[PDB]
Ligand binder design. Structure first.
Ligand SMILES: Nc1nc2c(ncn2[C@@H]2O[C@H](COP(=O)(O)OP(=O)(O)OP(=O)(O)O)[C@@H](O)[C@H]2O)c(=O)[nH]1
Ligand SMILES: Nc1nc2c(ncn2[C@@H]2O[C@H](COP(=O)(O)OP(=O)(O)OP(=O)(O)O)[C@@H](O)[C@H]2O)c(=O)[nH]1
Ligand SMILES: [Ca+2]
Ligand SMILES: [Ca+2]
Ligand SMILES: [Cl-]
Lengths: 164, 163
């Protein structure tokens, strides 16, 4: 049930406080610019922005390498811009159900919680994504850390992407 | 805060992930599709407009606060009539920027925080909503509770609808 897909979630760290700080006029411009940045970078990695969930986006890729490369590029771009917003990025892969312009299923929820575990400026991936990229000549991960994810039983090991 | 005055309602299913894990994707997708249909129908009955589906819920715009509250009341009633789904409902009003079929601004964020504060089966409204319904619209509230909302300074008094 469901087609295999790689799901990437983004989320701006403390976006409400930011909005309150800079005001709605500045916020609308900021988020408009951010939307364009993400959309552009996703299309460069042949991804698809499924929808804008909260202060971020749900993005679908066919291959985990594309998702990680996208996340790496986004974090680089946001760092360049600051010279400020920090974004969390989470990536998970598995089967999920398509419904119009949306994806449903436990693996969508899992991807969202992986992103929620990430610090601002960090890209976290689930164990299946890390394992799928175990032999990448360019992508590098840390040793991972164990967490429990809301709504799920057991423990999960999440891995941070180490970019050059 | 900028834009036009709008009443924003958020719905959010309580512990939807645990529910999904319990019944599986096949059953969950069937359940959420049914739920989407239910919410859409009830929103339209009160002249509301579903702006988008935020998480396992919806962001909905209404012109008047009584419309939003009546929608919430009817939704909670319908879910009770009904694999059990409990939903938090939060309602706030204020100026927000409406562009590209979306709503932006601090009052959107505030509405989301109000919904997050609500218990499953509860309809919580901000003080501006409560004050706007002081007239006999056939709606009653509790005495309110004072809480901190993430991202905002100070406290806010939120009122539960007594249906
Ligand atoms: N919770 C929720 N938020 C939504 C929804 N739709 C749009 N949003 C937006 O998502 C934002 C929610 O902020 P959060 O990400 O939960 O919290 P934050 O202020 O960024 O703080 P962090 O915990 O660091 O992320 C609001 O500003 C809303 O405008 C929705 O359906 N549910
Ligand atoms: N966090 C987050 N979730 C999203 C987003 N877009 C869609 N979702 C879905 O919304 C659901 C979020 O789960 P939560 O509402 O935070 O948690 P829950 O399991 O319902 O438990 P509660 O805290 O009681 O609501 C998941 O099923 C996600 O797949 C998004 O942009 N951010
Ligand atoms: Ca955020
Ligand atoms: Ca929920
Ligand atoms: Cl979590």
């Amino acid at each position: 049930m469901g087609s295999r897909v790689v799901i990437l979630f983004t989320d701006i760290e403390e976006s409400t406080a930011l909005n309150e700080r800079i005001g709605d006029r500045a916020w609308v411009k900021l988020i408009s610019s951010h939307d364009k940045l993400v959309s552009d970078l996703v299309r460069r990695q042949s991804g698809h922005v499924v929808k804008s969930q909260g202060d971020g986006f749900m993005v679908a890729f066919a291959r985990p390498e594309q998702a990680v490369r996208c996340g790496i590029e986004l974090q680089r771009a946001l760092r360049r811009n600051a010279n400020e917003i920090r974004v969390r990025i989470g990536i998970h892969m598995g089967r999920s159900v398509r419904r119009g312009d949306d994806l449903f299923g436990r693996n969508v929820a899992m991807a969202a919680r992986v992103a929620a575990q990430a610090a601002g400026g960090e890209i976290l991936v689930s164990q299946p994504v890390r394992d799928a990229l175990s032999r990448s000549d360019g992508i590098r991960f840390d040793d991972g850390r164990e967490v429990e994810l809301k709504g799920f039983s057991g423990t999960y090991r999440l891995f941070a992407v180490l970019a050059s």
